[PDB]
Design an enzyme around this catalytic site. Structure first.
Site, PDB file in Angstrom:
ATOM      1  N   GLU A  90      40.461   8.126 -10.482  1.00  0.00           N
ATOM      2  CA  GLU A  90      40.322   8.642 -11.834  1.00  0.00           C
ATOM      3  C   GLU A  90      39.190   7.889 -12.518  1.00  0.00           C
ATOM      4  OE1 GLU A  90      42.048   7.560 -15.481  1.00  0.00           O
ATOM      5  OE2 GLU A  90      43.622   9.094 -15.342  1.00  0.00           O
ATOM      6  N   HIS A  91      39.004   6.635 -12.119  1.00  0.00           N
ATOM      7  CA  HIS A  91      37.955   5.800 -12.689  1.00  0.00           C
ATOM      8  C   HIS A  91      36.554   6.154 -12.216  1.00  0.00           C
ATOM      9  CE1 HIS A  91      39.769   2.164 -14.814  1.00  0.00           C
ATOM     10  NE2 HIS A  91      40.762   3.021 -14.651  1.00  0.00           N
TER      11      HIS A  91
ATOM     12  N   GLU B 174      42.641  -3.472 -17.261  1.00  0.00           N
ATOM     13  CA  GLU B 174      43.502  -2.485 -17.885  1.00  0.00           C
ATOM     14  C   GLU B 174      44.955  -2.769 -17.508  1.00  0.00           C
ATOM     15  OE1 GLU B 174      41.983   1.291 -16.439  1.00  0.00           O
ATOM     16  OE2 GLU B 174      40.610   1.374 -18.153  1.00  0.00           O
TER      17      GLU B 174
END
Ligand SMILES: CCCCCCCC/C=C\CCCCCCCC(=O)OC[C@H](COP(=O)(O)OCCN)OC(=O)CCCCCCC/C=C\CCCCCCCC
Ligand SMILES: CCCCCCCC/C=C\CCCCCCCC(=O)OC[C@H](COP(=O)(O)OCCN)OC(=O)CCCCCCC/C=C\CCCCCCCC
Ligand code: HEM
Ligand code: HEM
Ligand code: HEM
Ligand SMILES: CO/N=C(/C(=O)OC)c1ccccc1CO/N=C(/C)c1cccc(C(F)(F)F)c1
Lengths: 55, 101, 422, 49, 59, 271, 442, 54
Positions: free
Chosen positions: G58-59, G135
């Protein structure tokens, strides 16, 4: 624990919160005197009762 | 005619709380509604009630009453709480009615 | 059956504007927009606007605190009050079939409050709570101090009741604030999801606090101060601005565009913003995490423009300088004819997307019907936006580099520069 | 971080029917509760006697 | 599956659980006593009056 | 103060049972016949009647088995009274004492000691004097001479009546000619106390400022002296009719008049 | 009228490309739109060794494709005023874009380029590696999420659903360009994807642009096959993470839910609306209809609480979560469980009547804008294999009554062993046994 | 107070000594004698009274 032993002690505390530092209305009359008499009366019946029971 | 008024004024004097300098509303038993109403009283009215009551308790313990001059007169008795109390009850009944529906 | 309807908009004799649009949505959203806010507050009644905001659920002459909440909730509706330093909106949402029901409470709350002393007294400690959660975002503390540094009055007034005043506001002040501001000539009854005739019959045969414009806010004098807040935070939030443009002003569009050119908010998740000169500039300056954006606010009689930066303490120096150099560099013709083209699009897009929301739409509509009385067609707002020269943009930038700046920062400012060092 | 935390394995204690991680444990739930509750109800009967 | 049936019918609703205890006790008593007495007498054949009674029982 | 009150009613009931069983111990004539008269009342209860009674006696009449279990009960109950008394005061302390004006006394409270410890000790000696005067100068004033005669099941005393403190109830018992009805009436005469908390209609707590209720109150008191008096009299005219009048007015005053007059008074205060 | 407005809602068009991909959309008269691809993939599909891959993917998803590197890709999206966003959960992933309807086709090309051609630049991966690791430390301070993770970790202990979406510290420190590639090549496939769009767009022009950039066809029968996941076993149990140094405690309790397909979910949601939610800023305060909310206010039971009915393909979690001060946990839990028992035993028509209206408003509010309408279509298809119109939902919601809420709730809550997750200064909340007992007798 | 087990002046006592009463998790069977002594006492008193009556 607390300053005076009348409030900290698990028993005296009980004696204090019901017979010494117990907040009572300033205007209760003689009619409020019967509760205590009833209690004393009860202790007396029990006492004389036992003495009679022993004979 | 003025019969209901004669009776009231009569009962008012027969009751005698006015001899302690108390207002009719001062003598109300403090159930829930009354307790809420009291919390809504403006500060001044609340302190005046408090003094009146404390004063009455002191007379009561002394077994005295106020001098006849200081007795609350029927027509000068201020129903200071009745207004709040009626509102408190109106609100309660609204909620009660609504929670049934 | 349903189809294309048209956005009507009457105006009663007392000056009460009524906007309306039927989009046949299964849900409606009616609202009362009002010209009021901490802007009209005086040192004497500070915070009253805030408390009024929290007081929406208090008993009214027609409905009780209990019925207002139970009533609205009975039909799955909602009731809320949003506000800025100069506008307060009271709106309710619900399914089409309940508008008439939810309407009674909206009507009651905004035109017939009772502000009973006790209710008011129990409510005030809430100002302490409400304000506590809001200030969890450093973002909010600096903006308060920004407006306090940028102005000497009106707008300088905080949006959240100051501490010393919690518990000191009075029912008198609430009543007086409402009687002097919530007047028909300062209010608009907007309403998405409804037929204009209906929303109008309501507005008239129902609204009563009326006539005039009551209290007028003092002009927004510009101070140009610098308020700093040493609080330890590893992150320093800083905002440097200058008197910007007013609303309805032609000079507005120019700034809005210089905004996008400089960069205002990311469009790609976790992505870098290349189309952002400001971001890009700062990026080349610092190495550690940070953020920077074009700040722009447009008020009735004034506005603020500049940049806002979040960065690690030790690097606030380099980060703020960077943001500055990037502003000067733009005021000196550092703006491509293309940058102006890109921006203009991002702005039109952002505008158009910011109206898909029932909330977003009602807000857009109501805002005009209040500070105007008309609805600028979308093509018109578009025509106005791209009709901004590359020069206008470079000028806006100039106005910033030259104007007197006011700065607001908070965190471990140990390495944060002073307004006179930029 | 919490992402690194996981529940230890309880195979040494699980009842037979919920031993398999790919089987619904609900299907045997009335069975497991029915048994334990049966023990309990019986104690009540023994005690009431 | 009796355990499931039991659970659903008897042990789930607290009311039925109590009903099961009561009705269960009534039946347990009747059964348990008969068995106990039965066991006791068998372990004592011909020693109890119940056993020798017939010898003098005859008006 | 509902709970302080209900435990109170329980204290009264326990006290009565205690004195009842106690009275039987000397085994004089009134000891035996009082035991008989009262316990036979339960054979009037439907179906479980005769059982309950023969269970209580431990035989077919008041006899030795009854006496020995009565001694055990008499020795025991007083301790229950002491126990319950603690619960009584515990509930009481939740609210604290009420007062004669019936309004909050938070504005003026004083420590129990020395104010009330002294007031109570004084109260103790003031009562204790007449008590001792009676016990020392007129020992048998309150007792029945019939109890100076050993119990004899073959000789019914002419006038079987209780100690004064039970007379009011004995009167009510005898007011309802019908074994079962009288028993219920007796029971009700004391259990009625459990309803008092639910029959308060006044907007004020005490009767200090309620003159109509005050007379009703003294009417009731006089009503009780009358029942006490009827209780000590033989069952004959005019004591019979007077007795039912008194029994009837007793229940009426507590069940109908008090709540009614209270409401009426609320109106006279424009409430 | 409401009834009608529901009917006049433009239908959702769905057509299937022969390669297995489904294209759906709801055309509105809006100048702006939202289109994106919703993928039936997530941490549940990961294994013990690639856990976190889908998140790592997703990154990178946005850091450029092969046809156009980082700088170019961003610059191309930014410059058209388009917003590129997406996410990844346990059973569902998505990448969608907000732009003008005019760019609908160029958008579709961009999308297809992202899911099909992720660059997976070796240098980028080492960078997102440090980013994701941070994160994690950030998210580690969000008690609410630390709590729901723990709830899953124990409720579904020893299974796929027991894993977090972001993955482990190990998996992230070591995942390889290969694993990421493998994940994408293994999971992002036409039959398991849905191209949804909402706004002012022609279903036609959409699908046409679809066939054009979503060509890749399948040869074998396996490729056209959507894999059935091994079922995850639910376990009544608890995990207690205690830290008295934390200011407030978080608690979450839940029983096993039925899973997307089941109709009862309509009733469960109606049920949750009865209890609802709260937070210290709800002006309604002590007059809120939600009994639990009222008690919370009257007794200062908590800072907030929420009910939830999280669904999954074959299972789910039905429960509640609250945040309270160390000394009010016990009473909060007490009333909370109390309200559940009320649900099973004494729900009123007035309550459901209201719960329904709240639910209706809730569903409608979930289609407020293009992005949210698109999210619904992407999700509905992927989970129900079709679109359920508000007109339908309403029909179902209206069939619910007191009697039904009681039977359904009794069926899922009464006398069940729940899953419990508690984090913070939780000493006052205690004993699984005690909690288990709160699961029966109103 | 929410539950009547804590507010009530009596149940509160029953609760703070026999229900919500905090007890060590590791006390053994040797701690079982306090309760047995209590029950033992209740039983002696009960059978005692029954004997005393005869
Ligand atoms: C012929 C006889 C017929 C008449 C007898 C009437 C007696 C009937 C009693 C009513 C039925 C009881 C109802 C219980 C319901 C409450 C309950 O939850 O169960 C008890 C509950 C169990 O909890 P759960 O397993 O979680 O159950 C959850 C159900 N979904 O608590 C218990 O453990 C109680 C049962 C164990 C009893 C232990 C007693 C040990 C004593 C032994 C010594 C012998 C007795 C001598 C008495 C002395 C008298 C002077
Ligand atoms: C019950 C069993 C029946 C046994 C017989 C009953 C006892 C008979 C003895 C008579 C009682 C003697 C009391 C005489 C005292 C007279 C007196 O002082 O009355 C006036 C005085 C005025 O008070 P305030 O209105 O507050 O004034 C404040 C401003 N100055 O009134 C009082 O003192 C209050 C009266 C309380 C004492 C009541 C005593 C009588 C007892 C009987 C019990 C009756 C109740 C119900 C029992 C049912 C079973
Ligand atoms: C063995 C019997 C009893 C004992 C030892 C006893 C003792 C007490 C004591 C010590 C008090 C506080 C002092 C006072 O106000 O008198 C009290 C108060 C009280 N008792 Fe009793 N009591 C007994 C029986 C009863 C009975 C039979 C009732 C009612 C049927 C009762 C009702 C009350 C109540 C309502 C109070 C509140 C007094 C107030 O208004 O302040 N008590 N009792
Ligand atoms: C609640 C307190 C008590 C009350 C109201 C009470 C009442 C009575 C009464 C009315 C009698 C009959 C007196 C007579 O006329 O001869 C009596 C006798 C007796 N009581 Fe009590 N009593 C009480 C407590 C006790 C206790 C605690 C005991 C001893 C454990 C006891 C032992 C006796 C004995 C042995 C007699 C028989 C001797 C006699 O008749 O004088 N009493 N009691
Ligand atoms: C602390 C509890 C008690 C203890 C330790 C206790 C102990 C004893 C003992 C050792 C005996 C002799 C038993 C024998 O060998 O025959 C006895 C007898 C007796 N106890 Fe208790 N007792 C207790 C309580 C009571 C109470 C409360 C009562 C009744 C108010 C009572 C009534 C009697 C009577 C009547 C006997 C005589 C009959 C007999 O010997 O079996 N006891 N007790
Ligand atoms: C064992 O009898 N003791 C008597 C006595 O005077 O003891 C002081 C007595 C004497 C003569 C007639 C009736 C009674 C019985 O008491 N009479 C009545 C009428 C009564 C009334 C109410 C309650 C109770 C009771 F049971 F104590 F609870 C008893």
């Amino acid at each position: 624990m607390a300053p005076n032993i009348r409030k900290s002690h698990p028993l005296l505390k009980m004696i204090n919160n019901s017979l010494i530092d117990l907040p009572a209305p300033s205007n209760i009359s003689a009619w409020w005197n019967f509760g205590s008499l009833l209690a004393v009366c009860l202790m007396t019946q029990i006492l004389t009762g036992l003495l009679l029971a022993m004979h | 005619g003025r019969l209901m008024d004669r009776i009231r004024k009569w009962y008012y004097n027969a009751a005698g709380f006015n001899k302690y300098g108390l207002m009719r509303d001062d003598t109300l038993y403090e159930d829930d509604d009354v307790k809420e109403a009291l919390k809504r009283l403006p500060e001044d009215l609340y302190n005046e009630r408090m003094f009146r009551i404390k004063r009455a308790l002191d007379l009561s313990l002394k077994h005295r009453i106020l001098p006849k001059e200081q007795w609350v007169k029927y027509e000068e008795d201020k129903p200071y709480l009745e207004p709040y109390l009626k509102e408190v009850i109106r609100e309660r009944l609204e909620r009660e009615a609504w929670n049934k529906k | 059956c349903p189809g294309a309807e048209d956005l009507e908009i009457t105006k009663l004799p007392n000056g009460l504007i009524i906007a309306s649009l039927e989009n046949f949505s299964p849900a409606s959203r009616i609202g009362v927009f009002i010209k009021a806010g901490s802007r009209y507050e005086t040192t004497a009644n500070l915070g009253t606007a805030h408390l009024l905001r929290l007081a929406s659920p208090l008993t009214t002459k027609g409905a009780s605190s209990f019925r207002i909440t139970r009533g609205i909730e009975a039909v799955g509706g909602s009731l809320s009050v949003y506000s800025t330093r100069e506008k307060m909106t009271y709106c309710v949402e619900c399914l089409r079939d309940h508008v008439d029901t939810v309407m009674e409470y909206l009507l009651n709350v905004t035109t017939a409050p009772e502000f009973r002393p006790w209710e008011v007294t129990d409510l005030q400690p809430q100002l302490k709570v409400d304000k506590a959660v809001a200030f969890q975002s450093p973002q909010v503390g600096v903006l308060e101090n920004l407006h306090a540094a940028a102005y000497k009055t009106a707008l300088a007034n905080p949006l959240y009741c100051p501490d010393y005043r919690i518990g000191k506001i009075t029912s008198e002040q609430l009543h007086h604030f409402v009687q002097n501001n919530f007047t028909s000539a300062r209010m608009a009854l907007v309403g998405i999801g409804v037929k204009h005739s209906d929303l109008k019959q309501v507005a008239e045969q129902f609204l009563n606090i009326r006539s005039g414009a009551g209290t007028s806010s003092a002009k927004a004098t510009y101070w140009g101060g610098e308020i700093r807040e040493q609080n330890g935070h590893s992150l320093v939030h800083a905002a440097v601005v200058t008197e910007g443009a007013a609303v309805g002003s032609a000079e507005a569009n120019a700034f809005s565009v210089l905004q996008h050119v400089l960069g205002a908010g990311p469009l790609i998740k976790r992505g870098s913003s290349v189309t952002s000169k400001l971001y890009q500039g700062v990026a080349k300056a610092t190495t550690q995490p940070f953020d920077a954006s074009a700040f722009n606010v447009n008020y009735s009689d004034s506005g603020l423009f500049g940049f806002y930066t979040i960065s690690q303490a030790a690097h606030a120096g380099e980060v703020i300088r960077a943001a500055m150099n990037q502003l000067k560099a733009a005021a000196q013709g550092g703006v491509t004819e293309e940058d102006v083209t890109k921006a203009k699009n991002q702005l039109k897009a952002t505008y158009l997307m910011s109206v898909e929301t029932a909330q977003g739409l009602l807000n857009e509509i109501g805002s005009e019907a209040l500070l105007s009385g008309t609805h600028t067609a979308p093509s018109v707002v578009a025509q106005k936006i791209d009709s901004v020269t590359s020069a206008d943009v470079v000028n806006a930038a100039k106005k910033f580099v030259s104007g007197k700046k006011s700065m607001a920062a908070s965190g471990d400012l140990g390495s944060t520069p002073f307004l006179d060092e930029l | 971080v919490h992402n690194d935390v996981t529940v230890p394995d309880f195979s040494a204690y699980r009842r037979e029917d919920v031993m398999d991680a790919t089987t619904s444990s609900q299907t045997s739930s009335e069975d497991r509760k029915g048994f334990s509750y049966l023990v309990t109800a019986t104690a009540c009967v023994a005690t009431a006697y | 599956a009796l355990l499931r049936q039991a659970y659903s019918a008897l042990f789930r609703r607290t009311s039925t659980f109590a009903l099961t205890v009561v009705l269960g006790a009534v039946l347990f008593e009747r059964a348990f006593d008969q068995g106990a007495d039965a066991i006791f007498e068998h372990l004592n054949e011909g020693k109890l009056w119940k056993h020798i009674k017939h010898k003098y029982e005859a008006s | 103060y509902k709970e302080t009150w209900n435990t109170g009613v329980i204290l009264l009931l326990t006290l009565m049972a205690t004195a009842f069983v106690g009275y039987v111990l000397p085994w004089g004539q009134m000891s035996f016949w009082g035991a008989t008269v009262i316990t036979n009342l339960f054979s009037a209860i439907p179906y479980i009647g005769h059982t309950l009674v023969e269970w209580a006696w431990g035989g077919f009449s008041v006899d030795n088995p009854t006496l020995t279990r009565f001694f055990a009960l008499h020795f025991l109950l007083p301790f229950a009274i002491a126990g319950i008394t603690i619960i009584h005061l515990t509930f009481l302390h939740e609210s604290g004492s009420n007062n004669p004006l019936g309004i909050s006394s938070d504005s003026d409270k004083i420590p129990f000691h020395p104010y009330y410890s002294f007031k109570d000790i004084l109260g103790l000696t003031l009562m204790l004097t007449p008590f001792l005067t009676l016990a020392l100068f007129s020992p048998n004033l309150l007792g029945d001479p019939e109890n100076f005669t050993p119990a004899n099941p073959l000789v019914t005393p002419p006038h079987i009546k209780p100690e004064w403190y039970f007379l009011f109830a004995y009167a009510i018992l005898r007011s309802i000619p019908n074994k079962l009805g009288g028993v219920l009436a007796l029971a009700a005469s004391v259990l009625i106390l459990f309803l008092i908390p639910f029959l308060h209609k006044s907007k004020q707590r005490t009767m200090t400022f309620r003159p109509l209720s005050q007379t009703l109150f003294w009417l009731l008191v006089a009503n009780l002296l009358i029942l006490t008096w009827i209780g000590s009299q033989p069952v004959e005219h005019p004591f019979i009719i007077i007795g039912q009048m008194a029994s009837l007015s007793y229940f009426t005053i507590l069940l109908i008049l008090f709540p009614t007059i209270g409401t009426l008074e609320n109106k006279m205060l424009n409430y | 009228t409401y009834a009608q407005t529901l009917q006049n809602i433009p239908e959702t068009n769905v057509t299937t490309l022969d390669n297995g991909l489904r294209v759906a959309s709801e055309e509105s008269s809006q100048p702006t739109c939202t289109v994106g691809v919703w993928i039936g993939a997530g941490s549940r599909y990961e294994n013990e060794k690639n856990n976190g891959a889908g998140y790592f993917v997703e990154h990178l998803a946005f850091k450029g494709t092969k046809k156009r590197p980082c700088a170019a890709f961003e610059k191309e999206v930014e410059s058209m005023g388009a917003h590129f966003n997406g996410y990844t959960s346990r059973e569902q992933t998505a990448f969608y874009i907000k732009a003008l309807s005019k760019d609908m086709p160029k958008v579709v090309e961009l999308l297809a380029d992202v899911v099909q051609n992720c660059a997976l630049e070796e240098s980028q991966i080492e960078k997102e590696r440090g980013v994701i690791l941070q994160e994690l430390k950030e998210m580690d301070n969000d008690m609410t999420n630390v709590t729901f993770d723990y709830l899953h970790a124990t409720a579904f202990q020893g299974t796929a659903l027991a894993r977090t979406v972001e993955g482990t510290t190990e998996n992230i420190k070591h995942l390889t360009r290969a694993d990421l590639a493998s994940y994408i090549d293994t999971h992002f496939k036409a039959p398991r994807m849905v191209l949804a769009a909402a706004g002012g767009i022609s279903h036609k022009e959409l699908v046409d642009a679809a066939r054009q950039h979503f060509s890749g066809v399948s040869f074998t029968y396996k490729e056209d096959a959507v894999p059935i996941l091994p079922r995850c076993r639910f376990t009544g149990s608890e995990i207690r993470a205690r830290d008295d140094a934390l200011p407030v405690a978080h608690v979450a309790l839940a029983v096993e839910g039925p899973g997307w397909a089941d109709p009862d979910n309509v009733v469960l949601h109606v049920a949750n609306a009865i209890i609802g939610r709260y937070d210290r800023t709800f002006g309604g305060g002590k007059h809120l209809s939600s009994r639990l909310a009222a008690l919370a206010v009257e007794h200062k039971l908590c800072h907030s609480f929420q009910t939830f009915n999280t669904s999954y393909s074959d299972t789910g979690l039905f429960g509640f979560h609250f945040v309270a001060d160390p000394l009010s946990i016990d009473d909060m839990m007490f009333c909370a469980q109390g309200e559940w028992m009320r649900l099973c035993t004494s729900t009123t028509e007035s309550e459901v009547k209201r719960a329904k209206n709240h639910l209706r408003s809730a569903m409608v509010a979930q289609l407020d804008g293009t992005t949210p309408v698109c999210e619904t279509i992407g999700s509905h298809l992927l989970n129900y294999g079709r679109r359920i119109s508000l007109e339908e939902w309403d029909s179902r919601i209206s069939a619910v009554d007191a009697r039904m809420v009681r039977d359904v709730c009794s069926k899922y809550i009464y006398d069940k062993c729940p899953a419990l997750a508690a984090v913070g200064p939780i000493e006052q909340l205690l004993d699984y046994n005690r909690i288990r007992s709160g699961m029966y007798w109103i």
